[PDB]
Design a protein around this ligand. Sequence first.
Ligand SMILES: Nc1ncnc2c1ncn2[C@@H]1O[C@H](COP(=O)(O)OP(=O)(O)OP(O)(O)=S)[C@@H](O)[C@H]1O
Ligand SMILES: [Cl-]
Ligand SMILES: [Cl-]
Ligand SMILES: [Cl-]
Ligand SMILES: [Cl-]
Ligand SMILES: [Cl-]
Ligand SMILES: [Cl-]
Ligand SMILES: [Cl-]
Length: 859
Amino acid sequence: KPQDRLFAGQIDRMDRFALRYRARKYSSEQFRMPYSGLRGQRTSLIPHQLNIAHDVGRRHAPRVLLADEVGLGKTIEAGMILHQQLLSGAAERVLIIVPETLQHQWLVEMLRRFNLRFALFDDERYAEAQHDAYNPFDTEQLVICSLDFARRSKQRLEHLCEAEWDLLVVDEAHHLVWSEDAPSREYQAIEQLAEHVPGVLLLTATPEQLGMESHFARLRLLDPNRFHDFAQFVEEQKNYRPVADAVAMLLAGNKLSNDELNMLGEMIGEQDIEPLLQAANSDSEDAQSARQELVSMLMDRHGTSRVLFRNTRNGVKGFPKRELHTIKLPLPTQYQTAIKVSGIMGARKSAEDRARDMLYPERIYQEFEGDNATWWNFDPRVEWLMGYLTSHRSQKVLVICAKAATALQLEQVLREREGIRAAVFHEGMSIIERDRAAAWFAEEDTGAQVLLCSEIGSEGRNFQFASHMVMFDLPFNPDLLEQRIGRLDRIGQAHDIQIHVPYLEKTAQSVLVRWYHEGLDAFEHTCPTGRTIYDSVYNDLINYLASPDQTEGFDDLIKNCREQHEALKAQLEQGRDRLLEIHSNGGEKAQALAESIEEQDDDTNLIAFAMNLFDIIGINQDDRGDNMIVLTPSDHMLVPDFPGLSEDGITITFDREVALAREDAQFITWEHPLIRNGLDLILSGDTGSSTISLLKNKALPVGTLLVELIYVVEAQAPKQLQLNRFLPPTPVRMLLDKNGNNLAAQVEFETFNRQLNAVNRHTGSKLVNAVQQDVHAILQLGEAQIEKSARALIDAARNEADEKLSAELSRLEALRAVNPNIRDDELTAIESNRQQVMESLDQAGWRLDALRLIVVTHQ
Ligand SMILES: Nc1ncnc2c1ncn2[C@@H]1O[C@H](COP(=O)(O)OP(=O)(O)OP(O)(O)=S)[C@@H](O)[C@H]1O
Ligand SMILES: [Cl-]
Ligand SMILES: [Cl-]
Ligand SMILES: [Cl-]
Ligand SMILES: [Cl-]
Ligand SMILES: [Cl-]
Ligand SMILES: [Cl-]
Ligand SMILES: [Cl-]
């Protein structure tokens, strides 16, 4: 086929032939990496996240509950699972359903960290998409919508169910509450969705102790066969508590009681168990190893760890300390008058509404003096903010308030008074507008030195050098408070977080500061008890907020809440399942997984191929020297529009640490779309498949003919079978003389390619037609040589495919014997996939892809 094009007049350029071979060779090599799908994401390599992603991401139709605590990376873990299944072909269509306020968070995270462009489906986008198909969700492969959107219409819900999704992601799944007599519409929608999508990821950090019926109902959504009875599940969790405590004491060091181990041995039921148990419970020279084998066999028999992952902050340390600094300020008489007239108008207004309103006195003032009324003239919080920023000009400060209107007013007064420039975040801006404001604030280069945020939820952007936070006001519930602090209290952040709270005395602000700090300790330590206690004392705490002058019993309430907080906190830590924690973080095997990816990171093959790829496609690279390159298209582009480019130009980097510091830059790996789209572009057609060249070599007779043939050995099969793990389309380069000697083993490609020069068209065409009959005789000589070569590759693959898939099949069958969380369809998927892989490798052959004729000259 390629020689027919050559003898018919197609002569390709030298760089096209070379790049075609290189791109096929590197594609063949990068597919077989054991860590594919975990390299391309713009994240740090945290072992507990990679352990979850590497386990769940390679399953057939994964159905797990991701229950890591707040800030531990549930969005990143879900993104890594999506990244693998989409890259490998195991999934094609993904549906992410989140609370309405977290939609933009997931769009930014999935695009800027995993290169996944999701489509937000709201009511206006839904009506737009209806014009194109019967099912409007068929118009996009990756969509995000809200719980309210999914539940609102039965007809729209049916379309969402029949849209043939491969993976379903539900964030903040604790919003799905089990109710025996009145399940919410959003519960019913997710329940129906979960029966129609094979792969489901439920995300919620809620402890099962704060609600057990809902926790079991979420697990039953994942596997209704295993989790079929609630009372049985409750009894299982009770029966297991002594085992988790005895195990916890083991790793803690204190040795075990006689009856405490025959209880570990009963749950690990097997005949010869005494030697291992005694070796572990000895603290000898062998006990260190003996416990890893012990807990390993206990994790395989754990009742829920196969489908439930829960890392904790006490288990995975690495979060910064949080320091509270309160600043009590006098109440100006303008607010005194505004509050009084407000109380005269709201004698009937509910205590709940009065409590919330008086938290933001600039809104009370404007509600009587008009919008944009000059409250910033007398508000002492503004003056304190002025003095703090003017005396801290070299550090990045993040200021948060509830309302955008207040945040936008602060930007103006701070600019008009002290000349300080501030980036602003609020819900009224576009994602791209917030992208610029973020990059402006991220500059250590006299960037924006203060970032002003409304209550808008964080979109995952990392501000490395930001460790100082000002709460201009306080949010109304403790869940919003931790979301605020989480903007800087990030994993891997080393500097202590300074939280400054300027507040007005004897107002609802002063009451809320006391309750958050003294009652919940919510500022300096992450609060797992806030919501639970807040619900119990809501209409009680509201009264003290609404009437800050009458403080009778407030100290008693604070005492009540703090004692309940401390008790619930310590109880959650006692019930912490250490065996579940170890399975969640992955131990030393996960640390090795993190090291292996970081070693693979610095890829000189990639930089080489990427620059060779961009020259041919026609991209102009401007190396800014700072580990960053600016890509701008040129005139001589192959395709008019190459996917990832814009006429404004994009910034790229190959270094993972630079990519984390500059999220405005593309993180180029073998798994980046720019690379995968460039590979497919040059390997799609026939460009570079047929050419002729001259070799200036005096050590060889004039006119001697060599042909270098690029064969490709491949099987044909659907991508979901994942045949590329064992036999991707693989090039087999041969270099033949007139007798058929294969010299490719002693003639390195790049060394020999640098000596082959193109021919002008008129001489080149004359030369090809002259040597044709000899070339045909050499082509016939190769067909026998490629056969033995291709048969060695296929037989190598079908043995490696049979060996790998036998291990996976045996591993899942060993688990099913001791674990109830192995689904029937999982065992059938491996058994069927293995048989189909063997059958596709049986029908694998060879073809000639490209050939380059070489004629020796002395000129
Ligand atoms: N490996 C990582 N590398 C870089 N940033 C990370 C990593 N893991 C987490 N982050 C950031 O830390 C923050 C917390 O991540 P999340 O996954 O959202 O935390 P989460 O609380 O477990 O999940 P939700 O859905 O937000 S409640 C985000 O700003 C992430 O971008
Ligand atoms: Cl050329
Ligand atoms: Cl919602
Ligand atoms: Cl419940
Ligand atoms: Cl400073
Ligand atoms: Cl953000
Ligand atoms: Cl407040
Ligand atoms: Cl007040």
